[PDB]
Enzyme design. Structure first.
Site, short mmCIF file in Angstrom:
data_model
loop_
_atom_site.label_atom_id
_atom_site.label_comp_id
_atom_site.label_asym_id
_atom_site.label_seq_id
_atom_site.Cartn_x
_atom_site.Cartn_y
_atom_site.Cartn_z
CB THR A 87 -2.17 5.93 -2.16
OG1 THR A 87 -1.59 4.84 -2.02
CG2 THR A 87 -3.23 6.13 -1.30
CB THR A 88 0.93 3.42 -5.67
OG1 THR A 88 1.27 2.70 -4.47
CG2 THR A 88 2.41 3.58 -6.70
CG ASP A 140 -6.54 -0.41 -1.33
OD1 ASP A 140 -6.46 0.59 -0.38
OD2 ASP A 140 -5.35 -1.07 -1.45
CG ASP A 151 -1.88 0.88 1.12
OD1 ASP A 151 -2.98 0.99 0.42
OD2 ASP A 151 -2.02 2.04 1.82
N1 LIG Z 1 -5.56 -6.76 -14.37
C1 LIG Z 1 -4.87 -5.56 -14.51
N2 LIG Z 1 -3.88 -5.34 -15.74
C2 LIG Z 1 -3.33 -4.12 -15.99
N3 LIG Z 1 -3.34 -3.36 -14.93
C3 LIG Z 1 -3.99 -3.34 -13.59
C4 LIG Z 1 -4.63 -4.59 -13.56
N4 LIG Z 1 -5.44 -4.53 -12.45
C5 LIG Z 1 -5.00 -3.18 -11.91
N5 LIG Z 1 -4.22 -2.61 -12.80
C6 LIG Z 1 -3.48 -1.04 -12.54
O1 LIG Z 1 -2.69 -0.97 -11.30
C7 LIG Z 1 -2.63 0.22 -11.02
C8 LIG Z 1 -3.13 0.50 -9.44
O2 LIG Z 1 -2.16 -0.31 -8.98
P1 LIG Z 1 -1.93 -0.34 -7.57
O3 LIG Z 1 -0.66 -1.21 -7.00
O4 LIG Z 1 -3.03 -0.81 -6.69
O5 LIG Z 1 -1.75 1.10 -7.22
P2 LIG Z 1 -2.27 2.38 -6.40
O6 LIG Z 1 -2.08 2.36 -5.01
O7 LIG Z 1 -2.00 3.51 -7.33
O8 LIG Z 1 -3.80 1.91 -6.75
C9 LIG Z 1 -3.92 1.09 -11.96
O9 LIG Z 1 -3.41 1.73 -12.75
C10 LIG Z 1 -4.70 -0.22 -12.39
O10 LIG Z 1 -5.13 0.39 -13.77
MG LIG Z 2 -4.53 0.15 -5.09
#
Ligand SMILES: Nc1ncnc2c1ncn2[C@@H]1O[C@H](COP(=O)(O)OP(=O)(O)O)[C@@H](O)[C@H]1O
Ligand SMILES: [Mg+2]
Ligand SMILES: Nc1ncnc2c1ncn2[C@@H]1O[C@H](COP(=O)(O)OP(=O)(O)O)[C@@H](O)[C@H]1O
Ligand SMILES: Nc1ncnc2c1ncn2[C@@H]1O[C@H](COP(=O)(O)OP(=O)(O)O)[C@@H](O)[C@H]1O
Ligand SMILES: [Mg+2]
Ligand SMILES: [Mg+2]
Lengths: 516, 516, 516
Positions: free
Chosen positions: B90-91, B383, B57
């Site tokens: 957040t990331t 989340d 996270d």
């Molecule tokens: N199956 C998937 N294929 C490609 N990208 C994905 C998939 N699932 C989630 N994402 C991408 O990962 C990003 C969010 O990742 P995450 O590690 O949860 O970061 P954050 O803390 O920013 O939400 C988003 O850009 C989302 O589009």
């Molecule tokens: Mg996330």
């Protein structure tokens, strides 16, 4: 349990290693950018001893800041090489290097692998060398008008620039004088002397040499015209066998006889000197006080214990042969000078050997009000002597004021069109890096780099003018060749090659391991 | 003589100020990039106390690293806001911010003035918000199939992703249940409980609440079905006037009479409770040991000193009214639950109030083998609860996997075409900044960002597919909407707005003055 | 033998004293010059605790640098006064002050005696105040179009300037609302609330107040329309005589009777409240838990222990009378609001009292993505509220962008022509000092101050345009009044008067005696 690699050690890998180097480079570059060009400004550097250096000179600044950072040290080597091979463009080379590093960062942040960036740079650099050859104009090693423009360009932006015409003429005469019969110029045969005085315009060329010794006996003449000079590096003292020898005296009368025999040997040494026709004598070793007498009675000006380096330059100026056997001294060994005078200069007594006919070494006597002012004039004179020497040796020059970098930049982009793949981004990067020069020139002149670049780039496009550059005074693009702003081809070729090779070297690093 | 500004102070101006901030931002960004997306990886953070947090996270990581650097602190605020307003991305927001700073550097090194960069960014950001509205799809707050995809997308790349279908269904039920009559979702009415057990699949939804208290007397029932619950936040102790009062006894007989009168008052309190029809009682205050007796004799389950927060959620689940006057307790105030049971869970005795009919608060009981594993499942559930809530509230979603950023990027470049002047470079910069997302996703999946970007950009050009994104498994561009990779419009809008506002704020800084 | 004046003391006399002060002033001025105007830049200030302030705000910066230097402290007082009396132009006033000191040095180095410089300054300053009155335009306190330009001018160069039209309209509405019946504006009746959210455009005006307290019992309504509000600053607890009193109970039955009597007193208190027609109740003191019950049974929203300041503003907005005797509460004491709602804002529960009819206090709710961003928006809003207030109060404005200073400068030179003697140099100095404003504006915009000053001075000469100033974007002299760049006459009058008085004070110093 125990640690494998040393515990007393910092380590930076991948991104961190790259950042460390790139950062160091850029920061070094940024500390000298302000010095570049006609509106360049100077740094005042104070050491831990409280000694002051004020200078515009890139490599000087970099040496005087005692930089410890390992990557910075690499960039500083770029400046040192530029100094050794060319004598000018040290700032230019370092600034281009920093820029290549900065442009490399943009490519690495896009995930282009370092080796590919490197490859691309190498290609651009080779192409630049080829282009630089087609860009250069030919000049004759005896074209004083062009050599003089070369020197004046060098001095522009230095503060010695107030006296640049006079200085340039003197410098061109000086360098022309010492050119050897293979067409090469040894910067060492031009002795620089620094002496306080009324002003910088008192600076003069001496066809001959200054010797920091006084005549060995006040009974000798202070002045002598059309002099026949003798160079002796054996001593005028009583000779002594190599095999240990001692005299034994048993008869009181024979006492004097030995003293007299020695006096005669000395008298004979002087007489042999007189017989060669010499009226002036420089000796590398000592002169027995009695010989000093005899020499004076013969009206011969003599100086003793002259620096080996002095003898060597005296020889070069006057046509004399340094002799090691007084017995073998003939008139053909004697050198010639219009005037040999002991006189004072800034309250120091020295021996002037001037008005020589075809000297193979000469003296630039640099004058100014204060020591630190002179020092910087001298640093500038060194730059000019350098590029004038380069021109005489190479016979190739290019236009200044950033024009050449822009032309280079423009052509390199054309070249990049035909590069397939990722390497292409590196080549365009390299191209764009060169524009740091015209940008910095404008920046330092308080102009707007973005728009002048647009204007200058335009003047170069199509089949325009390779000599077009920004005039940082009028604010217009002008023909730099017509304005007499020119530099030896060697300044650009070296600066670029140096920047390329060293940044390529850094970009290949992925691990930094520092100790203690 | 004396110093004007404090002597105990560092100061960084112009270039140095800009570098300090830009650098800090980038470095913060770089420490969380590795966590982004399906192939994201987790950090293990140890504090000075030796306590461990392992998490994917973003904002959690940034809070746990105790960052002191003043510019970094600003970027971290971006993550904190994203957490408050959205609960996800957040990331993403932090990474975009870093990228904007990095792209700003390239413009500043060309001598584009900061205010112009800022202006440009503001324009791009406003345009992005407009574009994001036209890009979003509409969805109904009761579309469980789409809500479930929203949750599953959230959990992807978390390690709780092993149980993402089950988790998503539970999450969607949970959020759906607490939606108020204005259509809003309060994340607080979904109580998260964390308890070790056989595995993550033991995780369940409880229509009702868990109370960490035990029944006040063992004589009371442990279980009770179709219960009538009484919420009392006044105390079942003998009442005492506010004005100071003391009893005076002079007759020995009257001694008992006062004790008895008190016993009766208490007996009467219980009898009033029984009369409402209640068989279960939660009290926020205390319960006299004698009242506890009477309650037990009446077969009434009672718990004392219940957390105010508990009372409030108990009320929300069962339909009860928390009462402050026992006299005014009627059957209409009673709440209802299918089952109230005291039972053990991971060796802890608690009171389950479950199988409520139309609960306005609900409990997600999260299960896993070890504490740190559970904690992270929980972080992921949080989340998902967030984005499901956002979707229900907003009714707008967009496709994930970098597709939306690429579409945004592409349109913003079109927009920049019509920007005259230097500001244009800033708008293109902003556009290009967004591609950091699709690039990082690929990078983290060991793919080549440069080529996939080329492929994805192509799928978006012309009148192609706004839903096209890189599948980091197959390696192909695919329709992310068809693959069920979707996120609430609110995550993009907030992330971008946050990154823009905070980087604009930093870029306006030309002087940093730090103390001590 | 022993020392007369303390030994632990530094002392600076004559020249040294003057230099010390002049220097301090200039250095303070120089640290805020960079912030001045449309292209002004911001400082980031870190304290010894690691807390960050980033701001453009002159006086804020000067307060946050913890300046110890005694003469600097005096200049800082200039900024503090400007803040108190006007709320804008703090940087302007400090910069003018520095300039006066600098121009005074030139006169002192010519041996003009300090008192004469002082005398001259006093003359110029008085003349400037007279001239400033003839220069100002009249405006009506209800000319919203002009008030709006005033606010927008204020926000220009602040980063909140992205939202300056919306912000200005809100600010103008807010200030207009709180103008009293003597035509004065109390900045305190405009409450500023700061809350994170989606963006700065979410910033709104609330006809009413925000109260950081939740309804006292969840059984009460959360929302209520066309509400009748009761303000009570006595407590709803059982009343207690001032003279010490104790109850004695001897009969067991009388035990209950006292409890019941107290319950009744409380029931009676609530009933009296209901009887006034009130459905909403804010109480400054406490509310017995039993009264809370009765209130809820009556459907009355009540909040307890409300900050005295809150009660006072609630009263101002709704038309209510704060009451200290529940007995004397009538319907005529009740206030009125369109909506009273407890709702969440950035995850905080608060009570909104909005849509009041003719509020005498209002709330500006400022929104932005991050705390530090908001803080600065707020600082800008404060500046605007200030100058809008000044305009409404004074009815006099002048043109901005340095135009007024140039006009002033030009006229003061005319005035100086008729000054006989040495004092004249001081008057011309003062005149020239004012040009530091138009110079700094240009400087900060990267323009050439010397030439723009020449151009602007020309547009003012003869019988030209008093409104002519440099447009730091187009680079042209323009009509600042036509461009809507205007400021309250009070900003110039106060800044100049403050600079003049404090520099005169400093120039009178010939001895500085510092201790420890
Ligand atoms: N199956 C998937 N294929 C490609 N990208 C994905 C998939 N699932 C989630 N994402 C991408 O990962 C990003 C969010 O990742 P995450 O590690 O949860 O970061 P954050 O803390 O920013 O939400 C988003 O850009 C989302 O589009
Ligand atoms: Mg996330
Ligand atoms: N009159 C001029 N107008 C414009 N540029 C000039 C002029 N004279 C010299 N330059 C440029 O200044 C640069 C060299 O400046 P200098 O400060 O000596 O740096 P370096 O140490 O690199 O030689 C070169 O690009 C040169 O062409
Ligand atoms: N659009 C504009 N064009 C030119 N000057 C402006 C404009 N808006 C404001 N100014 C000038 O900026 C100055 C105020 O700048 P600011 O940074 O707020 O300093 P201060 O704290 O002294 O008010 C004033 O002289 C004002 O006339
Ligand atoms: Mg040079
Ligand atoms: Mg202002």
């Amino acid at each position: 349990q125990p640690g494998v690699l040393p515990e007393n050690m910092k380590r930076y890998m991948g991104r961190d290693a790259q950042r460390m180097n790139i950062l160091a480079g850029r920061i070094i570059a940024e500390t000298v950018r302000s010095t570049l060009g006609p509106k360049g400004m100077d740094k005042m550097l104070v050491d831990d001893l409280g000694d002051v250096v004020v200078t515009n000179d890139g490599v000087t600044i970099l040496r005087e800041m005692s930089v410890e950072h390992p990557a910075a040290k690499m960039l500083i080597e770029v400046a040192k090489t530029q100094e050794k091979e060319v004598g000018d463009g040290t700032t230019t080379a370092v600034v281009v290097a920093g820029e290549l590093l900065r442009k490399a960062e943009e490519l690495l942040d896009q995930n282009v692998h370092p080796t590919i960036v490197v490859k691309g740079y190498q290609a651009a650099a080779q192409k630049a060398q080829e282009l630089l050859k087609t860009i250069a104009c030919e000049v004759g090693a005896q074209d004083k008008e062009i050599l003089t423009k070369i020197a004046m360009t060098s001095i522009t932006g230095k503060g010695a620039e107030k006296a640049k015409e006079k200085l340039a003429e003197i410098i061109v005469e000086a360098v022309s004088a010492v050119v050897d019969d293979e067409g090469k110029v040894d910067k060492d045969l031009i002795k620089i002397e620094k002496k306080s005085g009324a002003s910088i315009d008192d600076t003069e060329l001496i066809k001959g040499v200054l010797v920091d010794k006084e005549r060995v006996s006040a009974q000798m003449p202070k002045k002598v015209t059309d002099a026949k000079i003798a160079l002796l590096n054996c001593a005028i003292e009583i000779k002594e066998t190599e095999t240990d020898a001692e005299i034994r005296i048993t008869d009181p009368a024979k006492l004097m006889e030995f003293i007299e025999q020695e006096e005669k040997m000395l008298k004979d040494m002087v007489a042999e000197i007189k017989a060669s026709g010499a009226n002036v004598l420089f000796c590398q070793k000592g002169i027995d006080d009695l010989a000093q007498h005899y020499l004076a009675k013969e009206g011969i000006v003599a100086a003793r214990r002259v620096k080996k380096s002095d003898m060597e330059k005296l020889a070069k100026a006057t046509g004399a042969n340094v002799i090691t056997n007084i017995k073998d001294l003939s008139a053909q060994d004697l050198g010639d000078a219009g005037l040999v005078e002991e006189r004072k200069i800034s309250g120091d007594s020295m021996i002037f050997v001037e008005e020589c006919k075809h000297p193979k070494a000469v003296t630039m006597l640099i004058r100014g009000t204060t020591e630190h002012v002179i020092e910087e004039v001298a640093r500038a004179v060194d730059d000019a002597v350098g590029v004038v020497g380069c021109t005489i040796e190479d016979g190739r020059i290019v236009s200044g004021g950033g024009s050449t970098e822009v032309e280079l930049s423009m052509k390199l982009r054309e070249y990049a069109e035909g590069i397939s793949g990722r390497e292409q981004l590196a080549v365009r990067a390299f191209a764009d890096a060169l524009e740091v020069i015209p940008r910095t020139l404008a920046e330092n002149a308080g102009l707007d780099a973005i728009e002048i670049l647009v204007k200058v780039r335009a003047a170069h496009a199509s089949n325009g003018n390779k000599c077009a550059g920004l005039n940082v005074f009028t604010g217009a693009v002008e023909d730099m060749c017509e304005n007499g702003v020119v530099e030896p081809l060697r300044v650009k070729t070296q600066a670029i090659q140096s920047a390329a090779e060293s940044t390529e070297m850094l970009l290949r690093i992925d691990d930094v391991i520092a100790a203690e």
